[PDB]
Design a protein around this motif. Structure first.
Motif, short mmCIF file in Angstrom:
data_model
loop_
_atom_site.label_atom_id
_atom_site.label_comp_id
_atom_site.label_asym_id
_atom_site.label_seq_id
_atom_site.Cartn_x
_atom_site.Cartn_y
_atom_site.Cartn_z
N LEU A 107 -31.86 88.96 33.84
CA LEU A 107 -31.01 89.47 32.77
C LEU A 107 -31.14 90.98 32.60
O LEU A 107 -30.14 91.67 32.35
N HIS A 108 -32.36 91.53 32.68
CA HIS A 108 -32.52 92.98 32.59
C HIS A 108 -31.72 93.69 33.68
O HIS A 108 -31.12 94.75 33.44
N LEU A 109 -31.75 93.16 34.90
CA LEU A 109 -31.02 93.82 35.99
C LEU A 109 -29.50 93.66 35.84
O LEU A 109 -28.75 94.59 36.18
N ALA A 110 -29.04 92.47 35.43
CA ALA A 110 -27.62 92.26 35.15
C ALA A 110 -27.13 93.22 34.06
O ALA A 110 -26.00 93.74 34.14
N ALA A 111 -27.96 93.46 33.03
CA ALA A 111 -27.60 94.41 31.99
C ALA A 111 -27.47 95.82 32.53
O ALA A 111 -26.58 96.57 32.12
N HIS A 112 -28.40 96.23 33.41
CA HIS A 112 -28.30 97.53 34.04
C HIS A 112 -27.00 97.62 34.86
O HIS A 112 -26.30 98.64 34.82
N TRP A 113 -26.66 96.56 35.60
CA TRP A 113 -25.43 96.63 36.39
C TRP A 113 -24.19 96.60 35.51
O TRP A 113 -23.16 97.16 35.89
N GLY A 114 -24.33 96.10 34.27
CA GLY A 114 -23.23 95.99 33.31
C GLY A 114 -22.32 94.80 33.55
O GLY A 114 -21.16 94.84 33.17
N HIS A 115 -22.83 93.73 34.17
CA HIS A 115 -22.02 92.58 34.55
C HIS A 115 -21.99 91.52 33.45
O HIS A 115 -22.91 90.70 33.31
N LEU A 116 -20.87 91.47 32.72
CA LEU A 116 -20.78 90.61 31.54
C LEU A 116 -20.81 89.14 31.91
O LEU A 116 -21.39 88.32 31.18
N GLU A 117 -20.16 88.76 33.00
CA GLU A 117 -20.12 87.35 33.36
C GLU A 117 -21.47 86.88 33.89
O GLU A 117 -21.85 85.73 33.66
N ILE A 118 -22.20 87.73 34.61
CA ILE A 118 -23.56 87.37 34.99
C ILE A 118 -24.46 87.24 33.77
O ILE A 118 -25.24 86.29 33.66
N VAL A 119 -24.38 88.19 32.84
CA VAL A 119 -25.12 88.04 31.59
C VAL A 119 -24.80 86.70 30.93
O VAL A 119 -25.71 85.98 30.48
N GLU A 120 -23.52 86.32 30.89
CA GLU A 120 -23.13 85.07 30.25
C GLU A 120 -23.79 83.87 30.90
O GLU A 120 -24.35 83.01 30.22
N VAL A 121 -23.71 83.79 32.23
CA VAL A 121 -24.27 82.66 32.97
C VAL A 121 -25.78 82.56 32.77
O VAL A 121 -26.34 81.48 32.59
N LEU A 122 -26.46 83.72 32.82
CA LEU A 122 -27.92 83.72 32.67
C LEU A 122 -28.30 83.19 31.29
O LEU A 122 -29.21 82.37 31.16
N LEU A 123 -27.55 83.60 30.27
CA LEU A 123 -27.82 83.10 28.92
C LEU A 123 -27.55 81.61 28.83
O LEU A 123 -28.32 80.87 28.19
N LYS A 124 -26.47 81.13 29.47
CA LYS A 124 -26.18 79.70 29.47
C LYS A 124 -27.33 78.91 30.07
O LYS A 124 -27.61 77.78 29.64
N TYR A 125 -28.01 79.47 31.07
CA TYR A 125 -29.13 78.80 31.72
C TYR A 125 -30.46 79.07 31.04
O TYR A 125 -31.50 78.63 31.54
N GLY A 126 -30.46 79.76 29.90
CA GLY A 126 -31.66 79.88 29.10
C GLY A 126 -32.40 81.19 29.18
O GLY A 126 -33.57 81.24 28.81
N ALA A 127 -31.76 82.25 29.65
CA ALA A 127 -32.40 83.55 29.63
C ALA A 127 -32.73 83.93 28.19
O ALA A 127 -31.94 83.68 27.27
N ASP A 128 -33.86 84.61 28.00
CA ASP A 128 -34.27 85.05 26.67
C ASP A 128 -33.72 86.45 26.46
O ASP A 128 -34.22 87.43 27.04
N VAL A 129 -32.72 86.57 25.59
CA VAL A 129 -32.07 87.86 25.47
C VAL A 129 -33.00 88.91 24.87
O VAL A 129 -32.78 90.11 25.08
N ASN A 130 -34.09 88.52 24.21
CA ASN A 130 -35.00 89.46 23.56
C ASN A 130 -36.23 89.83 24.42
O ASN A 130 -37.07 90.61 23.97
#
Ligand SMILES: [Cl-]
Ligand SMILES: [Cl-]
Length: 159
Positions: A107-130
Protein backbone atom coordinates in the motif's frame (compact mmCIF):
# COMPACT_ATOMS: atom_id res chain seq x y z
CA UNK A 1 15.98 -25.96 -12.77
CA UNK A 2 19.44 -24.66 -13.64
CA UNK A 3 19.89 -24.36 -17.44
CA UNK A 4 16.13 -24.14 -17.90
CA UNK A 5 15.99 -21.99 -14.75
CA UNK A 6 18.31 -19.39 -16.25
CA UNK A 7 16.28 -19.33 -19.48
CA UNK A 8 13.02 -19.05 -17.52
CA UNK A 9 14.26 -16.01 -15.59
CA UNK A 10 15.32 -14.38 -18.83
CA UNK A 11 12.01 -15.19 -20.56
CA UNK A 12 10.02 -13.74 -17.66
CA UNK A 13 11.73 -10.36 -17.69
CA UNK A 14 11.83 -10.33 -21.51
CA UNK A 15 8.05 -10.84 -21.76
CA UNK A 16 8.29 -14.02 -23.88
CA UNK A 17 4.93 -15.60 -22.98
CA UNK A 18 5.19 -18.91 -24.86
CA UNK A 19 8.87 -19.44 -24.09
CA UNK A 20 7.76 -19.37 -20.43
CA UNK A 21 4.99 -21.89 -21.14
CA UNK A 22 7.40 -24.13 -23.04
CA UNK A 23 10.08 -23.97 -20.32
CA UNK A 24 7.49 -24.79 -17.63
CA UNK A 25 6.16 -27.71 -19.69
CA UNK A 26 9.76 -29.07 -19.98
CA UNK A 27 10.25 -29.06 -16.20
CA UNK A 28 11.84 -25.68 -15.41
CA UNK A 29 12.00 -24.76 -11.72
CA UNK A 30 9.14 -22.28 -11.19
CA UNK A 31 11.08 -20.72 -8.29
CA UNK A 32 14.48 -20.60 -10.03
CA UNK A 33 16.44 -17.71 -8.53
CA UNK A 34 18.81 -15.37 -10.33
CA UNK A 35 22.06 -14.13 -8.78
CA UNK A 36 20.12 -11.60 -6.69
CA UNK A 37 17.75 -14.35 -5.43
CA UNK A 38 14.76 -13.09 -7.46
CA UNK A 39 12.27 -15.56 -8.98
CA UNK A 40 10.45 -15.56 -12.34
CA UNK A 41 7.23 -14.40 -10.67
CA UNK A 42 9.03 -11.39 -9.17
CA UNK A 43 10.56 -10.51 -12.56
CA UNK A 44 7.22 -10.86 -14.36
CA UNK A 45 5.47 -8.81 -11.70
CA UNK A 46 7.81 -5.84 -11.97
CA UNK A 47 7.73 -5.88 -15.81
CA UNK A 48 3.94 -6.02 -15.94
CA UNK A 49 3.66 -9.32 -17.86
CA UNK A 50 0.20 -10.54 -16.84
CA UNK A 51 0.03 -13.72 -18.92
CA UNK A 52 3.43 -14.85 -17.59
CA UNK A 53 2.38 -14.12 -13.98
CA UNK A 54 -0.76 -16.22 -14.52
CA UNK A 55 1.20 -19.12 -16.03
CA UNK A 56 3.80 -19.08 -13.24
CA UNK A 57 1.07 -19.12 -10.59
CA UNK A 58 -0.61 -22.05 -12.37
CA UNK A 59 2.69 -23.96 -12.06
CA UNK A 60 2.86 -23.21 -8.32
CA UNK A 61 5.12 -20.16 -8.12
CA UNK A 62 5.66 -19.01 -4.55
CA UNK A 63 3.44 -15.92 -4.45
CA UNK A 64 5.26 -14.56 -1.38
CA UNK A 65 8.89 -15.16 -2.41
CA UNK A 66 10.84 -12.54 -0.47
CA UNK A 67 14.24 -11.10 -1.23
CA UNK A 68 16.92 -10.27 1.34
CA UNK A 69 15.52 -6.72 1.55
CA UNK A 70 12.00 -7.94 2.25
CA UNK A 71 10.43 -7.15 -1.13
CA UNK A 72 7.77 -9.46 -2.60
CA UNK A 73 6.09 -9.73 -6.03
CA UNK A 74 3.13 -7.77 -4.65
CA UNK A 75 5.47 -4.92 -3.64
CA UNK A 76 6.75 -4.65 -7.17
CA UNK A 77 3.37 -4.99 -8.88
CA UNK A 78 1.95 -2.23 -6.68
CA UNK A 79 5.13 -0.11 -6.97
CA UNK A 80 5.05 -0.23 -10.79
CA UNK A 81 1.34 0.39 -11.16
CA UNK A 82 0.31 -3.06 -12.48
CA UNK A 83 -3.34 -3.34 -11.48
CA UNK A 84 -4.27 -6.74 -12.92
CA UNK A 85 -1.07 -8.33 -11.59
CA UNK A 86 -1.88 -6.94 -8.13
CA UNK A 87 -5.35 -8.47 -8.45
CA UNK A 88 -4.11 -11.93 -9.52
CA UNK A 89 -1.36 -12.04 -6.87
CA UNK A 90 -3.83 -11.22 -4.11
CA UNK A 91 -6.31 -13.77 -5.45
CA UNK A 92 -3.50 -16.34 -5.14
CA UNK A 93 -2.68 -15.50 -1.51
CA UNK A 94 -0.11 -12.69 -1.71
CA UNK A 95 0.52 -11.18 1.75
CA UNK A 96 -1.18 -7.81 1.65
CA UNK A 97 0.70 -6.43 4.67
CA UNK A 98 4.24 -7.70 3.90
CA UNK A 99 6.84 -5.24 5.22
CA UNK A 100 10.10 -4.72 3.34
CA UNK A 101 13.31 -3.68 5.13
CA UNK A 102 12.14 -0.05 5.29
CA UNK A 103 8.80 -1.13 6.77
CA UNK A 104 6.97 -0.35 3.53
CA UNK A 105 3.95 -2.42 2.54
CA UNK A 106 2.54 -2.69 -0.98
CA UNK A 107 0.00 0.00 0.00
CA UNK A 108 2.83 2.48 0.74
CA UNK A 109 4.29 1.86 -2.72
CA UNK A 110 0.89 2.04 -4.47
CA UNK A 111 0.34 5.40 -2.72
CA UNK A 112 3.70 6.66 -3.99
CA UNK A 113 2.76 5.57 -7.53
CA UNK A 114 -0.64 7.29 -7.05
CA UNK A 115 -2.64 4.26 -8.27
CA UNK A 116 -6.19 4.58 -6.93
CA UNK A 117 -7.44 1.22 -8.15
CA UNK A 118 -4.45 -0.63 -6.67
CA UNK A 119 -5.02 1.20 -3.38
CA UNK A 120 -8.67 0.08 -3.56
CA UNK A 121 -7.85 -3.60 -4.15
CA UNK A 122 -5.21 -3.67 -1.40
CA UNK A 123 -7.71 -2.23 1.07
CA UNK A 124 -10.34 -4.77 -0.01
CA UNK A 125 -7.84 -7.51 0.83
CA UNK A 126 -7.14 -6.06 4.26
CA UNK A 127 -4.30 -3.58 3.94
CA UNK A 128 -3.95 -1.41 7.05
CA UNK A 129 -4.34 2.12 5.81
CA UNK A 130 -2.71 3.52 9.00
CA UNK A 131 0.49 1.42 8.85
CA UNK A 132 3.67 3.45 9.32
CA UNK A 133 6.98 2.51 7.76
CA UNK A 134 10.24 2.70 9.71
CA UNK A 135 10.53 6.44 9.06
CA UNK A 136 7.01 7.04 10.36
CA UNK A 137 5.21 7.51 7.02
CA UNK A 138 1.67 6.37 6.24
CA UNK A 139 0.21 5.95 2.75
CA UNK A 140 -1.39 9.35 3.26
CA UNK A 141 1.96 11.01 4.08
CA UNK A 142 3.53 9.42 1.03
CA UNK A 143 0.73 10.61 -1.28
CA UNK A 144 1.00 14.17 0.13
CA UNK A 145 4.79 14.19 -0.14
CA UNK A 146 4.66 13.05 -3.79
CA UNK A 147 2.02 15.61 -4.73
CA UNK A 148 -0.62 12.97 -5.45
CA UNK A 149 -3.32 15.41 -4.33
CA UNK A 150 -6.31 13.35 -5.48
CA UNK A 151 -5.24 10.27 -3.57
CA UNK A 152 -4.17 12.27 -0.52
CA UNK A 153 -7.59 13.93 -0.41
CA UNK A 154 -9.30 10.53 -0.29
CA UNK A 155 -6.85 8.87 2.07
CA UNK A 156 -7.30 11.77 4.51
CA UNK A 157 -10.90 10.59 5.06
CA UNK A 158 -9.61 7.28 6.43
CA UNK A 159 -7.21 9.05 8.87
CL1 LIG B 1 13.11 -5.77 -8.55
CL1 LIG C 1 -3.33 14.60 -8.50
Amino acid sequence: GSDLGKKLLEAARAGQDDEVRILMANGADVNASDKAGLTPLRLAARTGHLEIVEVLLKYGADVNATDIYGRTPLHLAAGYGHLEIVEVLLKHGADVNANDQLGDTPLHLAAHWGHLEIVEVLLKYGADVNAQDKFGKTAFDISIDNGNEDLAEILQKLN
